[PDB]
Amino acid sequence: GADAKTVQDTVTQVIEQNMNGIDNLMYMSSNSDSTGTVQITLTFESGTDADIAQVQVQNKLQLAMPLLPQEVQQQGVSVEKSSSSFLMVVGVINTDGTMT
Amino acid sequence: ATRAFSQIKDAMVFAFNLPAIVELGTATGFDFELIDQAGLGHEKLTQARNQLLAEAAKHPDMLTSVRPNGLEDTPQFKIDIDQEKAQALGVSINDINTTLGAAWGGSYVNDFIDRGRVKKVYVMSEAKYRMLPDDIGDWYVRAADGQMVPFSAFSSSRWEYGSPRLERYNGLPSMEILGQAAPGKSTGEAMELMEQLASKLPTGVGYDWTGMSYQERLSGNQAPSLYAISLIVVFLCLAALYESWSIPFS
Amino acid sequence: PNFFIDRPIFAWVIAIIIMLAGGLAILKLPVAQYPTIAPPAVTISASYPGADAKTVQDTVTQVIEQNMNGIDNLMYMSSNSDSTGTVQITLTFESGTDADIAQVQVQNKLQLAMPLLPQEVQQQGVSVEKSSSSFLMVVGVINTDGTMTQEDISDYVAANMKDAISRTSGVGDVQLFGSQYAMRIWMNPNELNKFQLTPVDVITAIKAQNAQVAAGQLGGTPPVKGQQLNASIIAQTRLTSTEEFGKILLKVNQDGSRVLLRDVAKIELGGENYDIIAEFNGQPASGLGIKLATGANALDTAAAIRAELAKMEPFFPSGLKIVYPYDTTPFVKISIHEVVKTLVEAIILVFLVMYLFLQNFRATLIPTIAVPVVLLGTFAVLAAFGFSINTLTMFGMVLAIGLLVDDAIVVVENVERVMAEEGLPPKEATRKSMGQIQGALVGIAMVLSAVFVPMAFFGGSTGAIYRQFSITIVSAMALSVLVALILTPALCATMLKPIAKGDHGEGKKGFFGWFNRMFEKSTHHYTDSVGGILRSTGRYLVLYLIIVVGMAYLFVRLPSSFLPDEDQGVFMTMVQLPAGATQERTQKVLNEVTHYYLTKEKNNVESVFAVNGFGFAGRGQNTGIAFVSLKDWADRPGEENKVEAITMRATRAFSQIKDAMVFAFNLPAIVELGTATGFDFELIDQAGLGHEKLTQARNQLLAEAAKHPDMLTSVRPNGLEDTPQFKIDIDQEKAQALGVSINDINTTLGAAWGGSYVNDFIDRGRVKKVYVMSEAKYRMLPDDIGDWYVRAADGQMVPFSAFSSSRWEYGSPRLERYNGLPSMEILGQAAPGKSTGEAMELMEQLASKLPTGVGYDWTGMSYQERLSGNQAPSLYAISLIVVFLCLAALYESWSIPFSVMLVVPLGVIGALLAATFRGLTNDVYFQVGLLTTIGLSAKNAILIVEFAKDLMDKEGKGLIEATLDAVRMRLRPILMTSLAFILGVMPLVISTGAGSGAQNAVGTGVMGGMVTATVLAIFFVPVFFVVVRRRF
Amino acid sequence: GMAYLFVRLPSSFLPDEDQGVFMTMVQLPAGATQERTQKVLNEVTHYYLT
Ligand SMILES: C[C@H](CCC(=O)O)[C@H]1CC[C@H]2[C@@H]3CC[C@@H]4C[C@H](O)CC[C@]4(C)[C@H]3C[C@H](O)[C@]12C
Ligand SMILES: C[C@H](CCC(=O)O)[C@H]1CC[C@H]2[C@@H]3CC[C@@H]4C[C@H](O)CC[C@]4(C)[C@H]3C[C@H](O)[C@]12C
What atom in ligand 1 is closest to the CA of residue B64? 26
**Residues B45, C944: Cα–Cα separation, whole Å:** 82
- Interrupted after residues, chain A (C–N over 2.5 Å): none
Query: Could you say which DSSP state residue C720 is in?
Result: -
**Residues B30, B178: Cα–Cα separation, whole Å:** 6
Ligand (nearest to CA of B6): 1
Burial of C184 (0-12, 13-18, 19+ CB in 10 A): buried
Please answer whether residues C885 and C901 qualify as being in contact, where contact means their C-beta atoms are separated by less than 8 angstroms: no
**Residues C917, C909: Cα–Cα separation, whole Å:** 12
Q: Do residues C998 and C878 both lie within one domain?
A: yes
Coil, strand or helix: which one is C434?
helix
Residues 6+ positions from C535 with CB-CB distance below 8 Å: none
Question: String of b and e for C552-579 (b: at least 16 CB within 10 Å)?
Answer: eebbeebeebbbbbbbbbbbbbbbbbeb
**Residues C270, C151: Cα–Cα separation, whole Å:** 8
C293 beta partners: C131
Coil, strand or helix: which one is B31?
coil
Please answer whether residues C49 and C86 qualify as being in contact, where contact means their C-beta atoms are separated by less than 8 angstroms: no
What are phi and psi for residue B208, nearest 5 degrees? -175, 150
Q: Which of C156, C605, B15 is nearest to D27 (CA)?
A: B15
Cα C381 to middle of ligand 2, angstroms: 44
What atom in ligand 2 is closest to the CA of residue C651? 22
Residues belonging to chain C with any Cβ–Cβ distance to chain D shorter than 8 Å: 219, 221, 223, 225-232
The CATH number of the domain holding residue A22 is 3.30.70.1430
Coil, strand or helix: which one is B155?
strand
**Residues C1000, C995: Cα–Cα separation, whole Å:** 9
Peptide bond between residue C222 and the one before it cis (omega within 30 degrees of 0): yes
Q: Do strands C175-176 and C283-290 pair parallel, antiparallel, or not at all (unpaired)?
A: antiparallel
The CATH number of the domain holding residue B175 is 3.30.70.1440
Residues 6+ positions from C520 with CB-CB distance below 8 Å: C504, C506
Query: Could you say which DSSP state residue C510 is in?
Result: S
What are phi and psi for residue B142, nearest 5 degrees? -95, 135
**Residues C983, C1010: Cα–Cα separation, whole Å:** 11
Please answer whether residues C375 and C389 qualify as being in contact, where contact means their C-beta atoms are separated by less than 8 angstroms: no
**Residues B76, B1: Cα–Cα separation, whole Å:** 35
**Residues C941, C899: Cα–Cα separation, whole Å:** 8
Q: How many residues does chain D have?
A: 50
- Domain boundary, last residue among C819, C854, C884: C819
Please answer whether residues C605 and C629 qualify as being in contact, where contact means their C-beta atoms are separated by less than 8 angstroms: yes
**Residues C411, C409: Cα–Cα separation, whole Å:** 6
Q: What range defines the domain where residue A13 resides?
A: 1-82
Residues of C in contact with D34 (CB under 8 A): 221, 223, 230
Q: How far is A36 from chain C (nearest CA, A)?
A: 10
Residues 6+ positions from B111 with CB-CB distance below 8 Å: B118, B119, B120, B121
Residues of B in contact with C259 (CB under 8 A): none
Q: Which of D40, C237, C216 is nearest to B132 (CA)?
A: C216
Q: Which of C1006, C1016, C1009 is nearest to C986 (CA)?
A: C1006
With residues binned 3-state (H G I as helix, E B as strand, rest as coil), the percentages for chain B, rounded to 5, are 35, 20, 45
Q: Which amino acid is at C58?
A: D
Q: Do residues B149 and B99 both lie within one domain?
A: yes
Please answer whether residues C599 and C355 qualify as being in contact, where contact means their C-beta atoms are separated by less than 8 angstroms: no
Element (H, E) at C977: helix C972-985
Q: Write out C787-809 in H/E/C secondary structure.
A: HCEEECCCCCEEEHHHCEEEEEE
Q: Is C716 in the pocket of ligand 2 (CB under 6 A)?
A: yes
Q: Do residues C494 and C550 both lie within one domain?
A: no
Burial of C257 (0-12, 13-18, 19+ CB in 10 A): exposed
Mutate to test the interface with C, among A3, A15, A19 (most CBs of C within 10 A): A3
- Domain boundary, last residue among C641, C657, C672: C672
Peptide bond between residue C791 and the one before it cis (omega within 30 degrees of 0): no
Closest residue of chain A to C113, computed from CA coordinates: A62
Technique that determined the structure? X-ray
C127 beta partners: C45
H helix intervals, C310-437: 329-335, 337-340, 342-348, 350-358, 361-383, 391-399, 402-421, 426-434
The angle formed by the CA atoms of residues D46, D48 and D50, to the nearest 5 degrees, is 60
B168 beta partners: B173
Residues 6+ positions from C958 with CB-CB distance below 8 Å: C952
Residue C345's CB: how many other CB atoms inside 10 A?
15
Burial of B246 (0-12, 13-18, 19+ CB in 10 A): exposed
Residues belonging to chain B with any Cβ–Cβ distance to chain D shorter than 8 Å: 1, 4-5, 10-21, 24, 27, 71-72, 74-75, 164, 186, 218-220
Q: How many residues does chain C have?
A: 1032
Nearest to B100 among C13, C216, C229 (CB): C216
Q: In the complex, which subunits touch D with 3 or more CB pairs below 8 angstroms?
A: B, C
Q: Do residues B67 and B143 both lie within one domain?
A: no
Q: Which of C910, C908, C903 is nearest to C1018 (CA)?
A: C903
**Residues C864, C76: Cα–Cα separation, whole Å:** 14
Cα B64 to middle of ligand 1, angstroms: 9
Ligand 2, atom 23, residue with closest C-alpha: C714
Element (H, E) at C594: helix C583-599
Please answer whether residues C325 and C609 qualify as being in contact, where contact means their C-beta atoms are separated by less than 8 angstroms: yes
What are phi and psi for residue C971, nearest 5 degrees? -105, -45
**Residues C369, C348: Cα–Cα separation, whole Å:** 12
Question: With an 8 Å Cβ cutoff, are A21 and C131 in contact?
Answer: yes
Q: Is B28 in the pocket of ligand 1 (CB under 6 A)?
A: no
Q: Which of C617, C227, C160 is nearest to B35 (CA)?
A: C160
Mutate to test the interface with C, among B36, B79, B109, B242 (most CBs of C within 10 A): B79
Q: Give the DSSP per-residue string, C157-213.
A: HHHHTHHHHTSSSS----EESS--EEEEEEE-SHHHHTTT--HHHHHHHHHHHS---
Question: With an 8 Å Cβ cutoff, are A9 and C217 in contact?
Answer: no
**Residues C683, C822: Cα–Cα separation, whole Å:** 8
Q: Which of C789, C781, C780, C690 is nearest to C740 (CA)?
A: C789
* Distances from the Cα of C818 to the Cα of A7, B37, C86, C638, C714, angstroms: 44, 45, 17, 45, 21
Q: Do residues C733 and C753 both lie within one domain?
A: yes
**Nearest-10 Cα torsion for C465, C466, C472, C475:** -150
* Distances from the Cα of C903 to the Cα of C163, C678, C938, C942, angstroms: 62, 37, 7, 10
Question: With an 8 Å Cβ cutoff, are A84 and B162 in contact?
Answer: no
C773 beta partners: C186
**Residues C1016, C886: Cα–Cα separation, whole Å:** 24
Element (H, E) at C9: helix C8-26
**Residues C899, C1032: Cα–Cα separation, whole Å:** 13
Q: Do residues B98 and B149 both lie within one domain?
A: yes
Q: Do residues C31 and C43 both lie within one domain?
A: no
Q: Write out C950-963 in H/E/C secondary structure.
A: HHHHCCCCCCHHHH
Coil, strand or helix: which one is B153?
helix
Residues 6+ positions from A21 with CB-CB distance below 8 Å: A56, A60, C129, C130, C131, C166, C167, C170, C171, C172, C173, C174, C293
Ligand (nearest to CA of C712): 2
Residue A26's CB: how many other CB atoms inside 10 A?
19
Q: How far is C306 from chain A (nearest CA, A)?
A: 16
Q: Is C337 in the pocket of ligand 2 (CB under 6 A)?
A: no
Cα B26 to middle of ligand 1, angstroms: 16
C82 beta partners: C814
**Residues A44, A42: Cα–Cα separation, whole Å:** 6
**Residues C95, C291: Cα–Cα separation, whole Å:** 19
Query: Could you say which DSSP state residue A8 is in?
Result: I
Please answer whether residues C416 and C840 qualify as being in contact, where contact means their C-beta atoms are separated by less than 8 angstroms: no
Q: What's CA B103's distance to the chain center, in Å?
A: 29
Cα C932 to middle of ligand 1, angstroms: 69
Please answer whether residues C904 and C940 qualify as being in contact, where contact means their C-beta atoms are separated by less than 8 angstroms: no
H helix intervals, chain B: 2-5, 42-56, 83-88, 93-104, 187-190, 223-242
**Residues C244, A82: Cα–Cα separation, whole Å:** 43
Coil, strand or helix: which one is C884?
helix
Q: Per the structure, how many domains does chain C have?
A: 8
Q: How many residues does chain A have?
A: 100
Question: With an 8 Å Cβ cutoff, are D31 and C226 in contact?
Answer: no
**Residues C193, C789: Cα–Cα separation, whole Å:** 6
Mutate to test the interface with A, among B74, B124, B166 (most CBs of A within 10 A): B166
Burial of C78 (0-12, 13-18, 19+ CB in 10 A): buried
Ligand (nearest to CA of B70): 1
Q: What's CA B235's distance to the chain center, in Å?
A: 52
B117 beta partners: B114
**Residues C418, C432: Cα–Cα separation, whole Å:** 8
Q: How far is B76 from chain A (nearest CA, A)?
A: 9
Q: How far is C172 from chain D (nearest CA, A)?
A: 39
Q: Which amino acid is at C185?
A: I
Q: Do residues B87 and B68 both lie within one domain?
A: no
Please answer whether residues C206 and C772 qualify as being in contact, where contact means their C-beta atoms are separated by less than 8 angstroms: yes
**Residues C153, C149: Cα–Cα separation, whole Å:** 6
Q: Give the DSSP per-residue string, C619-687.
A: -SSSEEEEE--B--GGG--SGGGSHHHHHHHHHHHHGGG-SS-EEEE---SSSS----SS--EEEEETT
Q: Do residues C639 and C649 both lie within one domain?
A: yes
Please answer whether residues C217 and C231 qualify as being in contact, where contact means their C-beta atoms are separated by less than 8 angstroms: yes
Coil, strand or helix: which one is C293?
strand
Handedness of CA C94, C98, C99, C100 (dihedral sign): negative
**Nearest-10 Cα torsion for C426, C428, C433, C437:** 130
Query: Could you say which DSSP state residue C284 is in?
Result: E
Helix axes C461-481, C361-383, angle to 10 degrees: 140
**Residues C223, B104: Cα–Cα separation, whole Å:** 12
The CATH number of the domain holding residue C257 is 3.30.2090.10
- Resolution of the coordinates in A? 3.8
Q: Do residues B85 and B154 both lie within one domain?
A: yes
Closest residue of chain A to C126, computed from CA coordinates: A63
CA atoms within 13 A on the CB side of D49: 6
What atom in ligand 2 is closest to the CA of residue C716? 6
Q: Which amino acid is at C356?
A: L
- Interrupted after residues, chain C (C–N over 2.5 Å): none
Q: Which long-range contacts (CB under 8 A, 24 or more apart) does D10-13 make?
A: D11/B186, D11/B218, D11/B219, D11/B220, D13/B20, D13/B27, D13/B218
**Residues C380, C386: Cα–Cα separation, whole Å:** 11
Please answer whether residues C186 and C267 qualify as being in contact, where contact means their C-beta atoms are separated by less than 8 angstroms: yes
Cα B42 to middle of ligand 1, angstroms: 27
- Domain boundary, last residue among C782, C800, C819: C819
Ligand 2, atom 14, residue with closest C-alpha: C648
The CATH number of the domain holding residue C1014 is 1.20.1640.10
Nearest to B97 among C227, C235, C252 (CB): C235
Please answer whether residues C412 and C360 qualify as being in contact, where contact means their C-beta atoms are separated by less than 8 angstroms: no
The angle formed by the CA atoms of residues B182, B185 and B188, to the nearest 5 degrees, is 105
Please answer whether residues C430 and C489 qualify as being in contact, where contact means their C-beta atoms are separated by less than 8 angstroms: yes
Q: Do residues C495 and C438 both lie within one domain?
A: yes
Question: String of b and e for B140-172 (b: at least 16 CB within 10 Å)?
Answer: ebeeeeeeebebeebbeeeeeebbbbbbbbbbb
**Residues B245, A35: Cα–Cα separation, whole Å:** 71
Please answer whether residues B95 and B81 qualify as being in contact, where contact means their C-beta atoms are separated by less than 8 angstroms: no
Residue A47's CB: how many other CB atoms inside 10 A?
7
Q: Which of C917, C912, C949 is nearest to C934 (CA)?
A: C912
Cα B178 to middle of ligand 1, angstroms: 10
Q: Write out C832-860 in H/E/C secondary structure.
A: CCCCHHHHCCCCCCCCCCCCCCEEEEECH
**Residues B240, C7: Cα–Cα separation, whole Å:** 8
Coil, strand or helix: which one is C290?
strand
**Residues C264, C195: Cα–Cα separation, whole Å:** 8
Please answer whether residues C718 and C617 qualify as being in contact, where contact means their C-beta atoms are separated by less than 8 angstroms: yes
Query: Could you say which DSSP state residue B136 is in?
Result: G
Q: Is C10 in the pocket of ligand 2 (CB under 6 A)?
A: no
**Residues C585, A34: Cα–Cα separation, whole Å:** 53
Q: Do residues B176 and B64 both lie within one domain?
A: yes
Mutate to test the interface with B, among A27, A39, A72 (most CBs of B within 10 A): A27
Q: How far is B238 from chain C (nearest CA, A)?
A: 9
With residues binned 3-state (H G I as helix, E B as strand, rest as coil), the percentages for chain D, rounded to 5, are 45, 10, 45
**Residues C49, C52: Cα–Cα separation, whole Å:** 9
Residues belonging to chain A with any Cβ–Cβ distance to chain B shorter than 8 Å: 1-5, 8, 12, 16-17, 27-34, 43, 71, 74-75, 83-87
What are phi and psi for residue B114, nearest 5 degrees? -85, 110
Q: How far is C135 from chain A (nearest CA, A)?
A: 15
Q: Which of C700, C739, C788 is nearest to C193 (CA)?
A: C788
**Residues C1021, C964: Cα–Cα separation, whole Å:** 11
